[PDB]
C-alpha cells in the first residue's frame, strides 16, 4: 500500500504542502483505490482527507515587548548594540526639525502673525541652527514681536 | 494546420473551428482538431473513425 | 467591457445586429440591477436602481435578442 501519489494529489487539490495532508489510516484501501483528482475531491468531501491547520506561531511576547519599550523598559546602556547614529540618525532628526520649523514659519506667515522680512530672517536663522525646537522658535517669535512693539511704542 | 483541415474536410467531411499541433517525443505529429458545435464528435467517431 | 449610462444607447446597442445575448444580474445587497449585452467586440452593461423601470426596459428589448437572468451559482 503506497500512498505517495495520493498524498501529492491531495496536496495539489487542497492547495497546501504535503506535510499538511492527513490521510485516514483506517481507509488506506479506499485511498489506494482513489486514483484520480476527482476521487481525491470525493474523499475530501467525505472527510477521509483533511488539511491540517498551521503550526502555531504567536506574536504575543513581541507585543508585550513592544508595549514595554513604548513605556520605556529595556532601553538602558546594556541593551544597546549599535551607535547612537545607527539607532537614530541625527541627519534624520535634523531633517524632521527643519521641516517642522519651516512648516511653522509658513503657517505663521500665512496667518499674518509675522511678515515677509521677519519670515526670511527666521528662515535663515533656523537654517543656521538657532532654534532647537518649535517651542524655542515660538518663544523667539514672541520675544521679537514684544521688542518690536516696545520699539514702536518708544517711537 | 491549413493542410490538416483540408485533409479532414476532404476525407471525413469534417469542419474544424481550430487546430492545435504538437510534435511528439517519438518524432510524429499530433493534431487536436476542435469541431464545430453543429456536429457531434461522438457520432463522427462512432460512424467514420470507428473509435466506438 | 464598457458601461453605458444612457437607456436609449442601451436600446440601440440591443437593436444592433451583433448582439447575441442579454443577461440580467440582480444585486440585492447593493440594491441594483445590471443589464449586460454581449456584442462582437465589447460587453456593454447598464446599471440601474431596483425599480419597475428594469422590467419596462426588459419589455423594451427586442424579442429576437434572447435574455437570461443569471443564476445564483455559476455552475459549469
Amino acid at each position: 500500500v503506497n500512498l505517495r501519489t495520493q498524498k501529492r494529489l491531495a496536496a495539489s487539490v487542497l492547495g497546501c504542502g504535503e506535510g499538511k495532508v492527513w490521510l485516514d489510516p483506517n481507509e488506506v484501501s479506499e485511498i489506494s483505490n482513489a486514483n484520480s483528482r476527482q476521487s481525491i475531491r470525493k474523499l475530501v468531501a467525505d472527510g477521509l482527507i483533511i488539511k491540517k491547520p498551521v503550526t502555531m506561531h504567536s506574536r504575543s511576547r513581541a507585543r508585550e515587548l513592544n508595549l514595554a519599550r513604548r513605556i520605556g523598559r529595556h532601553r538602558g546602556f546594556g541593551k544597546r548594540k549599535g551607535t547612537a547614529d545607527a539607532r537614530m540618525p541625527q541627519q534624520v532628526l535634523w531633517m524632521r526639525r527643519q521641516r517642522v520649523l519651516r512648516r511653522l514659519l509658513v503657517k505663521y506667515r500665512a496667518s499674518g502673525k509675522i511678515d515677509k522680512h521677519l519670515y526670511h530672517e527666521l528662515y535663515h536663522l533656523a537654517k543656521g541652527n538657532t532654534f532647537k525646537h518649535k517651542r524655542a522658535l515660538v518663544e523667539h517669535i514672541h520675544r521679537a514681536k514684544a521688542e518690536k512693539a516696545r520699539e514702536r511704542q518708544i517711537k | 494546420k491549413a493542410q490538416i483541415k483540408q485533409a479532414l474536410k476532404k476525407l471525413y467531411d469534417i469542419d474544424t473551428v481550430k487546430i492545435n499541433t504538437l510534435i511528439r517525443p517519438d518524432g510524429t505529429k499530433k493534431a487536436f482538431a476542435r469541431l464545430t458545435p453543429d456536429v457531434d464528435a461522438l457520432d463522427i467517431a462512432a460512424t467514420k473513425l470507428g473509435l466506438v | 467591457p464598457q458601461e453605458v449610462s444612457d437607456i436609449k444607447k442601451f436600446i440601440e446597442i440591443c437593436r444592433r445586429k451583433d448582439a447575441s445575448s442579454a443577461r440580467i444580474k440582480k444585486n440585492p445587497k447593493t440594491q441594483q440591477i445590471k443589464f449586460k449585452v454581449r456584442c462582437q467586440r465589447f460587453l456593454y452593461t447598464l446599471v440601474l436602481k431596483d425599480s419597475d423601470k428594469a422590467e419596462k426596459l426588459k419589455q423594451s428589448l427586442p424579442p429576437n435578442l434572447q435574455i437570461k437572468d443569471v443564476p445564483k451559482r455559476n455552475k459549469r
Binding site: 491547520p53 503550526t55 502555531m56 | 461522438l42 466506438v52 | -
Partner: protein, 73 residues
C-alpha cells in the same frame, strides 16, 4: 497537546467513538439508554467509450516485448 511541532486536529473533523462517548457520559452519570444515543449515532456509444477509457487506463494496448510469440509454452 503537542503545539510546539504541530497543530491539534479540530474535533469536528474526527468521528467520535461510540463506546468512548458512552463511557464518558457514564462517568458523568447520565442515563444513556434512557436518552437514546443508539438512534442518534451513525453508521450506447457513450458507454462503449467509457469502457474503452477504463480498459485503456487499466491494460496497456500492446506489449512489444511479447507480442511476437502467442503460445504459452
Amino acid at each position: 497537546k503537542s503545539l510546539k511541532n504541530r497543530a491539534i486536529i479540530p474535533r469536528k473533523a474526527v468521528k467520535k467513538p461510540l463506546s468512548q462517548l458512552e463511557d464518558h457520559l457514564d462517568q458523568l452519570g447520565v442515563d444513556t439508554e434512557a436518552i437514546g444515543l443508539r438512534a442518534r449515532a451513525q453508521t450506447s456509444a457513450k458507454e462503449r467509450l467509457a469502457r474503452s477509457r477504463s480498459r485503456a487506463r487499466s491494460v496497456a494496448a500492446t506489449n512489444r516485448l511479447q507480442d511476437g510469440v502467442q503460445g504459452t509454452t
